[PDB]
């Protein structure tokens, strides 16, 4: 029973990972072949980039605008800056934008989304100059919409690169996202690889490699299938046309009859998928973005992401059939996600109930082997040795992703104590439950038998796992002390933050 379950879990996970690996490598090969025939100094596409931000750090915002200006694309029509502010505090963002770009900033009283006239000609009159908008804090979608209008306004705009305020971009990243689709008209969106630069904390570091994997595997695979389930907030491209075609629908997304004021990422992408358009992802385009460093903020962010995912899965499946042959992989992927979560939960429940030391030793060993294989692949792919830190991702996944999943599922339907509870009470109950299972197992197996070969194997395995985790923690600590694990960009970021 337990041996069969572990065996199928290991084979299933490794098989799916290997399939995703070969799919992503094929996608990368196709992208490289496509780039190989790109004419030099190619600037055929006119692009209007879009920024959206709210209460962003002034230094990070300044660096983002510096990167945007420093981009080497020679066919950028204009920069559209949208900030849901209309508040004295938000004027800092306007000042930062003024010190980098044209001083002109317009502050309309009224939001285009709630306006009876959604054309931007009410708020804008010139398209040549870069324009910054200050509007009442509505949230996300709206702001983007504003920009969308302002973009479409300019006909030349053939595509719109959407970038988050907190995002460092590369001169090439632009052409790098505004070119893939040249190859295939159908491509109506290009997901741009994003990278977590803040890696000081082990969490950030782990998340960094997590991002790495995600973008360069799943995304890549789906990209091969021209069906990247989701675009990239920090770095994302979008054909102006499909945008104009999805902006309004997406701007008006209500789940259970409730404007979904959550992750826009996914909804517009889901609309594009409903239209049957192909979405490809390129890894050659990189954008540096920060990551949460606090466990609680990571928990709430992952909970919001899980809510968006669960809300968008129904529509994703409902539209997957429109891709005919294609899309089958997308259905397989979502079914894999649900069945993998359910299998992990059931396996942990069985482990807690049975409390068989051999079983726990076996699952620990196979999980370590899986993480070792994944980290080895990641190191080989990135030509970088710090990818082995991903073996600790099991801890953070178990202790954060699962409670976030349960929180999202429980909070989908139906003073400060309550609100605080709705965020962390699931996580605290989960941690208490795992601790209780651990102590119950350890007392239920409170015996020693050196004459038992199975007991000896379990003990040596658990000791080896402990020393392995300890040495990984030690090497991480010394790397942090010598600041070797810092990302290359973080060094000069700290330099000009200090010199300020």
């Amino acid at each position: 029973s337990a041996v069969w379950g572990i065996s199928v879990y290991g084979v299933f996970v490794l098989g799916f990972y290997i399939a995703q690996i070969v799919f992503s490598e094929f996608n990368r090969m196709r992208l490289s072949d496509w780039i190989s025939l790109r004419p030099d100094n190619w600037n055929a596409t006119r692009v209007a980039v879009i920024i959206a931000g709210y209460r962003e750090d002034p230094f990070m915002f300044k660096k983002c605008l510096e990167s945007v200006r420093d981009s080497e694309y020679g066919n950028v029509a204009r920069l559209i800056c949208v900030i849901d502010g209309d508040e004295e505090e938000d004027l800092k963002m306007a000042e930062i934008y003024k010190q980098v770009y044209n001083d002109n900033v317009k502050k309309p009283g009224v939001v285009l989304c709630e306006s009876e006239n959604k054309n931007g000609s009410t708020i804008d009159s010139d398209v040549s100059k870069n324009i910054c908008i200050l509007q009442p804090h509505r949230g996300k979608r709206e702001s983007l919409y504003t920009g969308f209008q302002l973009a479409s306004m300019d006909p030349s705009v053939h595509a719109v690169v959407l970038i988050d305020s907190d995002t460092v971009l590369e001169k090439n990243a632009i052409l790098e996202v505004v070119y893939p689709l040249s190859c295939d008209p159908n491509i109506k969106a290009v997901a741009g690889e994003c990278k977590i630069w803040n890696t000081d904390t082990i969490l950030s570091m782990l998340v960094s490699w997590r991002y790495f994997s995600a973008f360069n595997v799943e995304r890549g695979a789906q990209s091969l299938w021209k069906t990247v389930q989701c675009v990239g907030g920090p770095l994302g491209a979008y054909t102006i046309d499909i945008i104009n075609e999805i902006k309004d629908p997406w701007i008006t997304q209500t789940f259970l009859g409730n404007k979904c004021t959550y992750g826009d990422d996914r909804r517009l992408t889901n609309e594009v998928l409903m239209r049957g358009k192909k979405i490809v992802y390129t890894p050659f385009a990189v954008g540096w973005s920060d990551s949460p460093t606090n466990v609680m903020r990571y928990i709430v962010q992952q909970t919001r992401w899980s809510k968006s995912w669960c809300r968008e899965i129904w529509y994703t499946l409902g539209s997957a059939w429109k891709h005919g042959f294609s899309g089958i992989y997308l259905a397989f992927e979502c079914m894999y996600q649900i069945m993998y979560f359910f299998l992990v939960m059931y396996l942990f429940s069985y482990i807690a109930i049975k409390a068989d030391i051999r079983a726990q030793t076996a699952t620990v060993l196979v999980s370590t082997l899986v993480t070792i294989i994944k980290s080895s692949y990641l190191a080989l792919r990135a030509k970088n040795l710090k990818a082995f830190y991903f073996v600790l991702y099991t801890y953070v996944y178990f202790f954060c992703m699962i409670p976030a999943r349960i929180t999202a599922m429980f909070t989908m339907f139906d003073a400060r104590v309550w609100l605080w509870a709705k965020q962390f009470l699931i996580t605290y109950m989960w941690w208490a439950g795992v601790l209780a299972a651990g102590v119950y197992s350890i007392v239920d197996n409170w015996y020693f038998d050196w004459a038992d070969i199975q007991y000896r194997f379990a003990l040596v395995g658990i000791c080896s796992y402990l020393v392995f985790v300890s040495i990984v923690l030690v090497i991480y600590l010394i790397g942090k002390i010598t600041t070797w694990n810092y990302t290359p960009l973080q060094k000069e970021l700290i330099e000009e933050r200090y010199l300020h």
Partner: protein, 107 residues
């Protein structure tokens, strides 16, 4: 890379036919197909035109050129005509190319 609506201005009597050509120039990318838009004088809204009725559009792929033959012109046909070019293929971006426009006056 530019598009030229050669006959960009013209004034002609009612009850004749007019031909407006749309050519994509300086492009290494092959033309995919052409969309034609109309704006009524005074009005700014653009209205898309379709094959049929008095509108007959001919698309040439080898020369990357297209032309709209509008026949049997009435007074309300007076307005600015715009061609909207498309490029496609492998490594060829799906682009909108808007020509200079052709203002037509029908008396």
């Amino acid at each position: 890379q530019r598009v030229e609506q050669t006959p960009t201005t013209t004034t002609k009597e009612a009850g004749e036919s007019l031909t407006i050509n749309c050519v994509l120039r300086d492009s290494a990318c092959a033309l995919d197909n052409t969309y034609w838009y109309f704006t009524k004088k005074g009005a700014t809204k653009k209205e898309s035109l379709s094959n049929g009725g008095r509108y007959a559009e001919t698309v040439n792929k080898a020369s990357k050129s297209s032309s709209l033959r509008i026949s049997d012109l009435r007074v309300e046909d007076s307005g600015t005509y715009h061609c909207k070019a498309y490029t496609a293929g492998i490594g060829c971006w799906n682009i909108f190319y808007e020509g200079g426009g052709t203002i037509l006056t029908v008396k």
